[PDB]
C-alpha cells in the first residue's frame, strides 16, 4: 500500500497472513472460523498443497510473528473455471483444522447479500502488508488507506484497459495515482462501510505498476462468486 497510514491495533480484525516456507507471502480474509478467502493464482502449482502453509491471525506486527500460529491449513479449494493466461475467477478457499477462536481483536467480515445498491463512486478501504517503493522489500506492520471505486465502462476505455476487464472484476483507486496497491498484496481485503456494517466486495488479483496514473488496481468481484462459496461451504 502506497500513501497509507499505519493501522492501530483492533482496527481491521480480519487480516489473515499466509506464511509459506517460514515467511509471509500473501494475505487473506476470514469470513467463518473454518474458511479463509484469498487469491487463486498464488495457490497454483506447485504450491497447490494442503501442507506447507501456516496461517497467522491477530498478529498486528511482523515482529511477533514466529514459530507458533493458527492450525494447519486444510485442503485448498480453487475455482475450477480459473485460467492462467487470461485472468478470470481468481478466488481460492483455505480451510483450517482447528476453529478460529474469536479473540478480542478478531471479527470476521460479512459477505455481501445479492443486491446492495452500491454507489458508483463509493469509499472503500484496502489493507495489507505491501510496499511503498519500486517493488519494495517487505512490510513489518499493517498499512491501510482509502480508495474510490471506478466505473466499469470508464475503466475499460482504450486509454486504461482495452477490453481486459471481465464482468467478474472491478476497478478501484485514483486515476491521478499516488494511491494504489503493489506487489505482495495478494488477497488484500477490500471493505466498504454500508449501514454501519462492513462488507467484502473486492479481492486483489492483478495490476500494472504501483501508485502510477492511468493504471488503477483490478479487484475480483465477490458478488458473482458468492454462489460458489456457499456451494463449497454446503458441500464441505
Amino acid at each position: 500500500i502506497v500513501g497509507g497510514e499505519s493501522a492501530l491495533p483492533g482496527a481491521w480484525p480480519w487480516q489473515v497472513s499466509l506464511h509459506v516456507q517460514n515467511v509471509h507471502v500473501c494475505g487473506g480474509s476470514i469470513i467463518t472460523p473454518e474458511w479463509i478467502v484469498t487469491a487463486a493464482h498464488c495457490v497454483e502449482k506447485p504450491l497447490n498443497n494442503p501442507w506447507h502453509w501456516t496461517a497467522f491471525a491477530g498478529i498486528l506486527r511482523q515482529s511477533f510473528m514466529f514459530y507458533g500460529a493458527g492450525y494447519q491449513v486444510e485442503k485448498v479449494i480453487s475455482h475450477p473455471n480459473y485460467d492462467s493466461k487470461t485472468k478470470n475467477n481468481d478466488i481460492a478457499l483455505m480451510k483450517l483444522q482447528k476453529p478460529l477462536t474469536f479473540n478480542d481483536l478478531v471479527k470476521p467480515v460479512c459477505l455481501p447479500n445479492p443486491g446492495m445498491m452500491l454507489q458508483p463512486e463509493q469509499l472503500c478501504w484496502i489493507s495489507g502488508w505491501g510496499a511503498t517503493e519500486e517493488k519494495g522489500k517487505t512490510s513489518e506492520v499493517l498499512n491501510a488507506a482509502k480508495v474510490l471505486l471506478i466505473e466499469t465502462q470508464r475503466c475499460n476505455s482504450r486509454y486504461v484497459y482495452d477490453n481486459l476487464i471481465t464482468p467478474a472484476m472491478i476497478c478501484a483507486g485514483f486515476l491521478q495515482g499516488n494511491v494504489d496497491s503493489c506487489q505482495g498484496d495478494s488477497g488484500g481485503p477490500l471493505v466498504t462501510s454500508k449501514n454501519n456494517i462492513w462488507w467484502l466486495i473486492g479481492d486483489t488479483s492483478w495490476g500494472s505498476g504501483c501508485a502510477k496514473a492511468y493504471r488503477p488496481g483490478v479487484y475480483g468481484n465477490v458478488m458473482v462468486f458468492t454462489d460458489w462459496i456457499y456451494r463449497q461451504m454446503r458441500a464441505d
Partner: protein, 354 residues
C-alpha cells in the same frame, strides 16, 4: 451675444473614426489604441456613435464633462449574441476568463454601440506563438461570425507535440504518431509498460485531451487564465492527431485543423446590425492635456459686443464686408495707432469691421 474665438493648440482626437472602422476585431484579437494630447467632445461622440448603454466603474459620468486626462486607453471587440451576459463586472464566464478581463481596480467606463452590418467584416486571428508555429492557419468559417476562446493553455519554449521515432518504433500496441521536431525541445513523454500478457504496451501523456485529462499533473500544457491586458496563450492541442505514423525523422510536426480544441463561434447580427463593446481606461484625473470641450462656449454665429477675439477683449459692433488683404496667418486688423478695427472668422471665412 458674446463672441469667443480661439485657435486650438492641439489637434482633434478623432475617436469616432477609429470606433467606426469597418474591420471589427474578434474578442480573441481585441485591439488597443492610446489617445493622448488631443481634444474631444464626449456628447458629440456619443451622438455620432449609436450608443445603447454607457456606465463607468469607480468614477462618475458627470465628472467626465470638462475634465483633463493624461491618456485614454481604448479596447474594442465584437459581442457574440449568446455570451452578451459574460461582460458583467465580475463573472466566471468564458469571455472574461479566456479573451479579455475587465479591470475593476481602476476608473473605467464601458460603452455598448452598434454599426450597420452591410459594411462590417470580422478579422479573426490567432495571437498564439506556439500554435502558429506548429501549423495553424485561417479559421475560414463564415462572414459576420466572431470566434471566442473557451479554454486557455500555456507552455514554455520546450514543447513539441511529437514522439521520438526511436521509442515509437518499439511499440507493438498503441503506437503513437512520431515525427521530426525542430532543433531544441523536449519530446512527448512516452514509456513502454508491461501488462499480464502484452509486453509492448506504450503509454504517453496528455490523454485523452487536455480539456478532460484524467491527470493534469502529467501533461505539459497547463490551463491558465488571462490577466489584465494579456491575450489568450493558446488553444488546446490533441497530441493523438499531431504528426504521422512511423516517420524516419524527415517530417515536420504539423497538427491537423481538427486537433485544436477549446474554441467556438457565434454570429453578431441583430436587427441588421452588429454589436460592439468598448472599454475606456482613464489615466490621471484633473491633470493632463487630453481635455473635453463640452463645457466651453460653442463658436456661435456672429450677430452682425462683449467679444474675446484671439486674446483681445472689448465691446463694439460688427458689419459684414469684403477684404482681400487677409493672409493665411492674419486674423486681426489694426489701425495706425494700436486699435482693433476688423477681424476674420476662421470657421466661416467672413470678414467683419469693428
Amino acid at each position: 451675444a458674446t463672441v469667443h474665438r480661439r485657435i486650438p493648440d492641439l489637434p482633434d482626437c478623432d475617436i469616432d473614426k477609429w470606433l467606426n472602422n469597418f474591420n471589427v476585431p474578434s474578442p480573441l484579437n481585441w485591439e488597443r489604441k492610446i489617445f493622448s494630447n488631443c481634444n474631444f467632445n464626449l456628447s458629440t461622440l456619443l451622438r455620432l456613435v449609436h450608443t445603447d448603454s454607457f456606465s463607468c466603474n469607480n468614477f462618475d459620468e458627470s465628472k467626465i464633462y470638462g475634465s483633463c486626462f493624461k491618456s485614454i486607453v481604448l479596447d474594442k471587440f465584437a459581442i457574440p449574441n449568446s455570451r452578451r451576459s459574460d461582460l458583467q463586472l465580475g463573472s466566471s464566464g468564458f469571455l472574461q476568463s479566456s479573451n479579455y478581463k475587465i479591470d475593476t481596480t481602476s476608473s473605467s467606463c464601458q460603452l455598448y454601440y452598434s454599426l450597420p452590418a452591410i459594411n462590417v467584416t470580422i478579422n479573426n486571428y490567432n495571437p498564439s506563438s506556439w500554435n502558429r508555429r506548429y501549423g495553424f492557419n485561417n479559421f475560414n468559417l463564415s462572414s459576420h461570425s466572431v470566434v471566442y476562446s473557451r479554454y486557455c493553455f500555456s507552455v514554455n519554449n520546450t514543447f513539441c507535440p511529437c514522439a521520438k521515432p526511436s521509442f515509437a518504433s518499439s511499440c507493438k500496441s498503441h503506437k503513437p504518431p512520431s515525427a521530426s521536431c525542430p532543433i531544441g525541445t523536449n519530446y512527448r513523454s512516452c514509456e513502454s509498460t508491461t501488462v499480464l500478457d502484452h509486453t509492448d504496451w506504450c503509454r504517453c501523456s496528455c490523454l485523452p485531451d487536455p480539456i478532460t485529462a484524467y491527470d493534469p499533473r502529467s501533461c505539459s500544457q497547463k490551463k491558465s487564465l488571462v490577466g489584465v491586458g494579456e491575450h489568450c496563450a493558446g488553444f488546446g492541442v490533441d497530441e493523438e492527431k499531431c504528426g504521422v505514423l512511423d516517420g524516419s525523422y524527415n517530417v515536420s510536426c504539423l497538427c491537423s485543423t481538427d486537433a485544436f480544441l477549446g474554441w467556438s463561434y457565434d454570429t453578431c447580427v441583430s436587427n441588421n446590425r452588429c454589436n460592439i463593446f468598448s472599454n475606456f481606461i482613464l489615466n490621471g484625473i484633473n491633470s493632463g492635456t487630453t481635455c473635453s470641450n463640452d463645457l466651453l462656449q460653442p463658436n456661435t454665429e456672429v450677430f452682425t459686443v462683449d467679444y474675446d477675439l484671439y486674446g483681445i477683449t472689448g465691446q463694439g459692433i460688427f458689419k459684414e464686408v469684403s477684404a482681400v488683404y487677409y493672409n493665411s496667418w492674419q486674423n486681426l486688423l489694426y489701425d495706425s495707432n494700436g486699435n482693433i478695427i476688423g477681424f476674420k472668422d476662421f470657421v466661416t471665412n467672413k470678414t467683419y469691421n469693428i
